[PDB]
Write a protein that binds this ligand. Sequence first.
Ligand SMILES: NC(=O)c1ccc[n+]([C@@H]2O[C@H](COP(=O)([O-])OP(=O)(O)OC[C@H]3O[C@@H](n4cnc5c(N)ncnc54)[C@H](OP(=O)(O)O)[C@@H]3O)[C@@H](O)[C@H]2O)c1
Ligand SMILES: NC(=O)c1ccc[n+]([C@@H]2O[C@H](COP(=O)([O-])OP(=O)(O)OC[C@H]3O[C@@H](n4cnc5c(N)ncnc54)[C@H](OP(=O)(O)O)[C@@H]3O)[C@@H](O)[C@H]2O)c1
Ligand SMILES: NC(=O)c1ccc[n+]([C@@H]2O[C@H](COP(=O)([O-])OP(=O)(O)OC[C@H]3O[C@@H](n4cnc5c(N)ncnc54)[C@H](OP(=O)(O)O)[C@@H]3O)[C@@H](O)[C@H]2O)c1
Ligand SMILES: NC(=O)c1ccc[n+]([C@@H]2O[C@H](COP(=O)([O-])OP(=O)(O)OC[C@H]3O[C@@H](n4cnc5c(N)ncnc54)[C@H](OP(=O)(O)O)[C@@H]3O)[C@@H](O)[C@H]2O)c1
Ligand SMILES: NC(=O)c1ccc[n+]([C@@H]2O[C@H](COP(=O)([O-])OP(=O)(O)OC[C@H]3O[C@@H](n4cnc5c(N)ncnc54)[C@H](OP(=O)(O)O)[C@@H]3O)[C@@H](O)[C@H]2O)c1
Ligand SMILES: [Mg+2]
Ligand SMILES: [Mg+2]
Ligand SMILES: [Mg+2]
Ligand SMILES: [Mg+2]
Ligand SMILES: [Mg+2]
Lengths: 262, 244, 248, 248, 261
Amino acid sequence: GMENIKLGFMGLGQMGSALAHGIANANIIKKENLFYYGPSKKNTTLNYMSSNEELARHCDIIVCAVKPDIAGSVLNNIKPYLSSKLLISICGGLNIGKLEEMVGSENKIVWVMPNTPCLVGEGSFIYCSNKNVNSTDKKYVNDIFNSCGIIHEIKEKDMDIATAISGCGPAYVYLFIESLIDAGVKNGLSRELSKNLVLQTIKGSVEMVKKSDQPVQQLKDNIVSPGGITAVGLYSLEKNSFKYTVMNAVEAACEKSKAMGS
Amino acid sequence: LGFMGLGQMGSALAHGIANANLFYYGPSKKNTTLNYMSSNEEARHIIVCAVKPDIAGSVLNNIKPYLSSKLLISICGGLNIGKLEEMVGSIVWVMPNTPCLVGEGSFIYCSNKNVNSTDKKYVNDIFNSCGIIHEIKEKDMDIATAISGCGPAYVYLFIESLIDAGVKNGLSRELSKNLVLQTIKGSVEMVKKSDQPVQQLKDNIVSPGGITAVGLYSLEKNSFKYTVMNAVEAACEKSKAMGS
Amino acid sequence: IKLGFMGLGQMGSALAHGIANANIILFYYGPSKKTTLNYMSSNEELIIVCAVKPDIAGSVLNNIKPYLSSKLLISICGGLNIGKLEEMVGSENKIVWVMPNTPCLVGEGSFIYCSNKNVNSTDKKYVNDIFNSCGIIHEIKEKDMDIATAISGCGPAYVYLFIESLIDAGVKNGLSRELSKNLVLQTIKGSVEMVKKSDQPVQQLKDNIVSPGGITAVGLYSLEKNSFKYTVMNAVEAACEKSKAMGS
Amino acid sequence: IKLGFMGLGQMGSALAHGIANANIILFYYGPSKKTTLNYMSSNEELIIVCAVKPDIAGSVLNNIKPYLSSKLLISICGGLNIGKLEEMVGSENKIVWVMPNTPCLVGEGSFIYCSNKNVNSTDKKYVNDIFNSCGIIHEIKEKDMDIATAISGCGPAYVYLFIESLIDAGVKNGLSRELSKNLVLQTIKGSVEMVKKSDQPVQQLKDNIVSPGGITAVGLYSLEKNSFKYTVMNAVEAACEKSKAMGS
Amino acid sequence: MENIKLGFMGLGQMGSALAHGIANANIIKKENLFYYGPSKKNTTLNYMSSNEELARHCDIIVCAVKPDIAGSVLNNIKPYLSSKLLISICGGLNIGKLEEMVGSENKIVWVMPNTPCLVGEGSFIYCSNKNVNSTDKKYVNDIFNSCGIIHEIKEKDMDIATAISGCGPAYVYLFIESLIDAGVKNGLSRELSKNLVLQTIKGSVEMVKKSDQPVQQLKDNIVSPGGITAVGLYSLEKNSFKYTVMNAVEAACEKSKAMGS
Ligand SMILES: NC(=O)c1ccc[n+]([C@@H]2O[C@H](COP(=O)([O-])OP(=O)(O)OC[C@H]3O[C@@H](n4cnc5c(N)ncnc54)[C@H](OP(=O)(O)O)[C@@H]3O)[C@@H](O)[C@H]2O)c1
Ligand SMILES: NC(=O)c1ccc[n+]([C@@H]2O[C@H](COP(=O)([O-])OP(=O)(O)OC[C@H]3O[C@@H](n4cnc5c(N)ncnc54)[C@H](OP(=O)(O)O)[C@@H]3O)[C@@H](O)[C@H]2O)c1
Ligand SMILES: NC(=O)c1ccc[n+]([C@@H]2O[C@H](COP(=O)([O-])OP(=O)(O)OC[C@H]3O[C@@H](n4cnc5c(N)ncnc54)[C@H](OP(=O)(O)O)[C@@H]3O)[C@@H](O)[C@H]2O)c1
Ligand SMILES: NC(=O)c1ccc[n+]([C@@H]2O[C@H](COP(=O)([O-])OP(=O)(O)OC[C@H]3O[C@@H](n4cnc5c(N)ncnc54)[C@H](OP(=O)(O)O)[C@@H]3O)[C@@H](O)[C@H]2O)c1
Ligand SMILES: NC(=O)c1ccc[n+]([C@@H]2O[C@H](COP(=O)([O-])OP(=O)(O)OC[C@H]3O[C@@H](n4cnc5c(N)ncnc54)[C@H](OP(=O)(O)O)[C@@H]3O)[C@@H](O)[C@H]2O)c1
Ligand SMILES: [Mg+2]
Ligand SMILES: [Mg+2]
Ligand SMILES: [Mg+2]
Ligand SMILES: [Mg+2]
Ligand SMILES: [Mg+2]
């Protein structure tokens, strides 16, 4: 049972709308029980509400989907209306300590880190919660995000690196896909065909990792025919520090999450 | 259906078709469900040339008299139709990848003058059972090989690098793997479903003054895009070099 | 209203001459006479524009401090935020921080502004009307002024250098400088017009020009090799860092 | 006159729709139906525009070879020069090599052309009128076509990426994508307008924006660090090399 | 030593390698080897209900957990370590940090192992506090010399020794991995490349071990004037091979000191 509880989204930006419509299409909560507020009305199936305060006073679970720089004032305005209610924050960088500083230690605070793929029911989520979040609250959190993806409960200290991989990850994958298509378009292939060949190559590779008992590096080794084509392409990636480039990008994002966390 | 050579690609392609619902030869017997045959010459058969390109010349020379009205399919890298017609006489050239083992392979092919629409129908059915196949121009085979054939290795290293970054900064290797694979799965799904181009989907994740922006800026610094494009082009160049 | 431009240098003149050619509303002072605007004996001599360099703006604004009662002070000084400006003239004064660019000289400027508590709707109405006459003005947050400066204020310099580099490339490979310039400016004019009119994003418009196996794909590959995007981004961020450092 | 666009892809459509919106003079063929232009059964079916990719242009022009008698053939294929074109249809035909860009869709294209011996003043008058209606056209030497392509033809892609990188920099540092875009496009619009109107050279216009000890000087220093000029020049030259290689 | 009870707190990658390394050496009875983890492991060692129970039961306690949770784990076993030998394999966490976690009253020894101890070829360095005597060091030496070679070194030298001996295998694995990839790229099979690589390294180590000539002279010996080796060695200098190896070690040593701060 989750059809009766009222879900409220404070802000419907790029992540807010993706998460809102991700849960809406999953059908675990009734359409008339999904609410939102923004300074401007959005093209959405969710029910508009007059303010964040009236959203917090009506809804049972409140989602903070605003930018972290304006999250402090928004949460301060709904501060007295969070009594006995569950607050879920998707704000990047803002950890439980900073959130407890914004609304109070007495409230139920859970910090969830989503990604945009939840729109197509394939989101990746990580979360941590404060002292006041119980087993029945965690059951609500799990069911909401498992309906439009896969959720893990992790330590609070691991949230910054997880954000860098799971939250920011799509962007690295999008750019990877973008770069592979461009390489194809440059060397004779159409943009449509390049995209098909790229997406199917990645889909197959991911499935191989999941299903095979062999590690990723052995699966990589298997493709390298002695004196062949793949060996030359991989040699090029090593030359240009492909591994370090990816690792450095993730770590740079991880530092930014921690910098905002101070 | 006969596989000449049962190595990493041979076994992957063989078991991919077998699971979809078969003979092979190698200098050593392999741990496989396929039926072993005494030689490449043993005339019995669709013939798949799954040997390395450096030995394919002599191996195809041995089966030259036994290819009378038989459909020869070659998966050898670099060796184009002109190079193959020199080896067996004036044939379809198919470029697979290992993910066909789990029925999710990517294939591209071109055919000579002797291959008609009925052989093409069998070509499409054999490979669409364990993946997706496209008929392309022969000139496009080298770049397609670079992306589709070599591609999984680029992705594996991409996955490998993302896990390493998670491990380095506190996450367990197992959790890092789960998060990486789901993130990639979700992103690919977004591309093929969305009406927005991939770059706009990339823009949507960049919250102004946020974390992702710093990650992408780091990728631009170290020329991530050029790195990927240079790797594909290096492989494409090698494919054309062996085809010369 | 009577405008007074304190400093008539490179930005002071460009702004003053931009509003003058717009015909909507002019006085100035400098240590040396410069212009169609009417010269005045000093800065103290009685809307006021502070168009001096930030290193001398401290003493210059401190001299006109007791003379800015019920008068609208607009500052175009880079880096010096409202916090720094209220330290220079006082919290009680009506202060608005506007960031212009030189293209306002030809009536095509880009402006961003923020204002303190004392600036009201009627004051903002004047500010908006003054700068929309010779360009486009946006009211933004004070925190966003540093990045907005780095793009809108410093921007022309990146674009001039962009034009400069494209012309040089044409000249190097056989084209005359005049023809190279003509082709470059039109190519950019058409591209800018394509972005604001097309429903497709800028990257899709970029994808449309890339013919498979073609010429554009090779040039665009060269830009990726030399980290073109990072280079542009690093420059804007470096400028943004400088603006915040001066505001500290 | 009756225009016929052989190929209606990314450039074919942009050019055809550019002249269509200009209202001065329309037919097309493709392997798949696309547009307001009238579809025709084949390329052979009877001014002709060859708007296909250069790799297939050889056979495509060879099919219409006996049908181009006393007809003006304009080719927009990149790399394929008049020497390569006269090999494809014959020396006796009237051939003109025009290099367009996609901005002609919004009536702001940039064109360069050269023509063989058989193209006369009346043929050039038509060519000039067709392309001046949706942009600006210049007649240049054939030898200069490769560099002119690299700048005017491929140019929009460099400008789109320039716009793309500036927007990303704004987004990274707190600005919304919509505002970043607005500021970027206006900043560039004003800069382009400053170059064509000012009597000062582009580098002097760049010097005017650099305040001593200021913000611009730091961003411009960052561009010099990352070889911004070379990057732009290397890209144009790389494209120019590609155009000549395809023309060989 | 068959009678003393050894306990491992955490059987991860290093925990299990050290545990099974000692187990295969047969110096301590099978029934006398104990472990605890939040999840039961596929191991020959006897499972125990908690770390506190493990501390109460065993004569020697091994801290094989990650350094970020070692503080709370050692805090829980704090009242159960009286007269017992505590050995810590945690990276970065020096004696100062350990005495801060359990108290300077305890017998604390900091040992830095590597996974090669699983095949009885581990490299160990150790330092101990004021309370660890000669008889305790007798136990330490015999435990780790059974599955490798142990050295007693200065506490200040532990960070660089960790960077070489502890982290070392990873560099060697990558080195081996890279040499195979080079063979595979240029026509050799993965199996043959591996065999040639491992034998080449095995022989080279033995030459450094047994020769009166320094490593650099042994290097010079293989370089024939105008030959093949010269070209390969020049390529390594071009891409700063020596610095790369040295920088990696220093970056690791830097990280060990940062955690020890
Ligand atoms: N991912 C990929 O690996 C991939 C992708 C696309 C295309 N390909 C193509 O597939 C071909 C094989 O690649 P691979 O990676 O599988 O190489 P591989 O692992 O070396 O496989 C070659 C196999 O052929 C066998 N063989 C050797 N000599 C033979 C002979 N005289 N007659 C018959 N069989 C013989 C070998 O058996 P033994 O093991 O007993 O020596 C070996 O198992 C290459 O041409 C490559 O271009 C591979
Ligand atoms: N992929 C991702 O983008 C992603 C992934 C993981 C986490 N996140 C997190 O999600 C949050 C939002 O990111 P985003 O990318 O969606 O940014 P965004 O697109 O700028 O979304 C912010 C939205 O909040 C609205 N808003 C502004 N002020 C408000 C207020 N006072 N009360 C309620 N709503 C207000 C805005 O509406 P208007 O448009 O009308 O101004 C805007 O649509 C960030 O904290 C980020 O860390 C994002
Ligand atoms: N494109 C741009 O240049 C640009 C863009 C945005 C913002 N800004 C801002 O505009 C301000 C000025 O920039 P700029 O490039 O115009 O610098 P500038 O060319 O050096 O102009 C400063 C002018 O102020 C005059 N001046 C010097 N001391 C004075 C005083 N004590 N009282 C009154 N006037 C005095 C100087 O006159 P003399 O010539 O007689 O010495 C000089 O012409 C800076 O704060 C900058 O942040 C400039
Ligand atoms: N910005 C630019 O893209 C640009 C700028 C300057 C010059 N050019 C030049 O313009 C030419 C085309 O460029 P593009 O970017 O438009 O490439 P494109 O988007 O691939 O357009 C080519 C079009 O030709 C059609 N086509 C294919 N085979 C044909 C045939 N046998 N007969 C007639 N039409 C056929 C295709 O139709 P289907 O879609 O049905 O396959 C396709 O739409 C190139 O030669 C290039 O050098 C382009
Ligand atoms: N080669 C090496 O890895 C190496 C070399 C030298 C030194 N070290 C040192 O050895 C230590 C562990 O390294 P590692 O690579 O083995 O990390 P690891 O593979 O993550 O092992 C840590 C293990 O501790 C367990 N654990 C977690 N919480 C526990 C608790 N409260 N009580 C008892 N056990 C708990 C975990 O069990 P679950 O799996 O059930 O969570 C995990 O298996 C580190 O301090 C490191 O500095 C490692
Ligand atoms: Mg996938
Ligand atoms: Mg059967
Ligand atoms: Mg007047
Ligand atoms: Mg008409
Ligand atoms: Mg050895």
